Design a protein around this ligand. Structure first.
Ligand SMILES: *CC(=O)N1CCC2(CC1)CN(C(=O)C1(Nc3ccc(Cl)cc3)CCOCC1)C2
Ligand SMILES: *CC(=O)N1CCC2(CC1)CN(C(=O)C1(Nc3ccc(Cl)cc3)CCOCC1)C2
Ligand SMILES: [Mg+2]
Ligand SMILES: [Mg+2]
Ligand SMILES: [Mg+2]
Ligand SMILES: [Mg+2]
Ligand SMILES: [Mg+2]
Ligand SMILES: [Mg+2]
Lengths: 5, 236, 236, 5
């Protein structure tokens, strides 16, 4: 999955 | 609410203890209590709120994906019928997830966003509104899926508009907003080109502004820039 | 109970799903529902029950230790007074932990142990009774601390007596019981010599019986033997 | 902490 903050 | 009798400062103190103990459900309940005192949140307090719910919903999303994958496998040709249990339990986790998202959205609507006038607070809360609508969108399959997606988009867009006007391109809130909106485009809106354009333009504009920063700000900004690069690498 | 309307087989199915999703609170609630159907548990079902509660209480113990350490630091000379919050939150976690232990002990007493006639089931349940009394002992500081310690000791001792009579020295249940009783001696009963003697004798008697085992049984036994060796290394 | 199972 892609990076989120 | 169960936290109504506890002092605001005590709730914040206990949220910090809960974080140290990796008790994120407790941390979230403490922060919900603190928000419901009705006073605005400081920067540190806003971050405690976000950390708590991010961790709770993050675990729920991971569980939901495990169960959804099992469910999808059960509906392939050749798969033996095992009854309603997989769907039921996926639904149970899904409902709990939606409950947490509705709780967060409720805090934002009553009344965190309307009282947030500074860019740092308003952008942060609008990003959170985008994020929790995005989590709702991940599990949505019905009549309202388009409206849920649009709610996420609208919140992210308002946050982006303010961030571009009011914050430098290296501001970590601006960067994290762009990171997450880019992921919205890729994963939710079926818009991988927009996702890639946003991540690249955000990275490049940040790069150009690093020269203005202290060592400590540089470290903060470059960490999130690396997340943008990581996504770009994944997508290209 | 909330699981009273769900089929036994569905509860077991959902416990397995919860395990895959790392949803151990759910897993425990499902298994509690299954036990409360009143039928004896198979070996696989006994292990599901144990895995679920071990993981729930394990997280609570880790959180309790974090908070207890903070509390102890607050009571050192020079430490600034911060009010009742650290004690209160440690107490909250402690009470929840004690609740889970009481739940498990309740299942064992009503009526898993009394119906367990085979060595594999009876030893397993008595080991669990020892384990959950040991977790109560870890947090006990009052009038009943000695009785709680003795309850753990008594359960472990009954389990050891049956295991020595009825099981080979390489049986994983016998080995895991000895491992945990040894830790009881070291950490709870202030008896490090007894802990070390038990771990060494258990290891050595198991070593001598490995020749009787298949490849797969050998792997099972030697894994737990390594845990015994690890503790011995820590303690000597 | 020591190993238990
Ligand atoms: C006071 C305030 O606004 N915040 C949010 C930004 C933060 C300090 C507290 C810097 N920061 C981060 O850099 C990390 N998390 C994060 C960044 C950006 C947003 Cl919009 C939200 C969260 C970066 C990722 O690792 C955790 C810290 C928190
Ligand atoms: C059916 C039954 O009695 N059980 C318990 C023993 C087990 C299979 C299911 C083998 N086993 C293990 O080897 C591990 N856990 C464990 C061992 C011994 C006891 Cl008394 C309890 C648990 C060893 C540690 O890693 C997990 C498996 C479970
Ligand atoms: Mg007050
Ligand atoms: Mg649903
Ligand atoms: Mg644009
Ligand atoms: Mg039935
Ligand atoms: Mg107490
Ligand atoms: Mg002896």
């Amino acid at each position: 999955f892609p990076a989120t903050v | 609410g169960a936290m109504g009798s506890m002092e605001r400062a005590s709730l914040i103190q206990k949220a910090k203890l809960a974080e140290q103990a990796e008790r994120y459900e407790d941390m979230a309940a403490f922060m919900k209590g603190a928000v419901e005192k009705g006073e605005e949140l400081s920067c540190e307090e806003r971050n405690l709120l976000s950390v708590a719910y991010k961790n709770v919903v993050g675990g729920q999303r991971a569980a939901w994906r495990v169960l959804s994958s099992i469910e999808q496998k059960s509906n392939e040709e050749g798969s033996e019928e095992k009854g309603p249990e997989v769907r039921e339990y996926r639904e149970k986790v899904e409902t709990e997830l939606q409950g947490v998202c509705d709780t967060v959205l409720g805090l934002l609507d009553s009344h965190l966003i309307k009282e947030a006038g500074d860019a740092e607070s308003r952008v942060f809360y609008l990003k959170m509104k985008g994020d929790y609508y995005r989590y709702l969108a991940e599990v949505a399959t019905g009549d309202d899926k388009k409206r849920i997606i649009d709610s996420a988009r609208s919140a992210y867009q308002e946050a982006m508009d303010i961030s571009k006007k009011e914050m430098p391109p290296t501001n970590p809130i601006r960067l994290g907003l762009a990171l997450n909106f880019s992921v919205f485009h890729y994963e939710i809106a079926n818009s991988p080109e927009e996702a890639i354009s946003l991540a690249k333009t955000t990275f490049d504009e940040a790069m150009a502004d690093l020269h203005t920063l202290s060592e400590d700000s540089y470290k903060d900004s470059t960490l999130i820039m690396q997340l943008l690069r990581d996504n770009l690498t994944l997508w290209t």
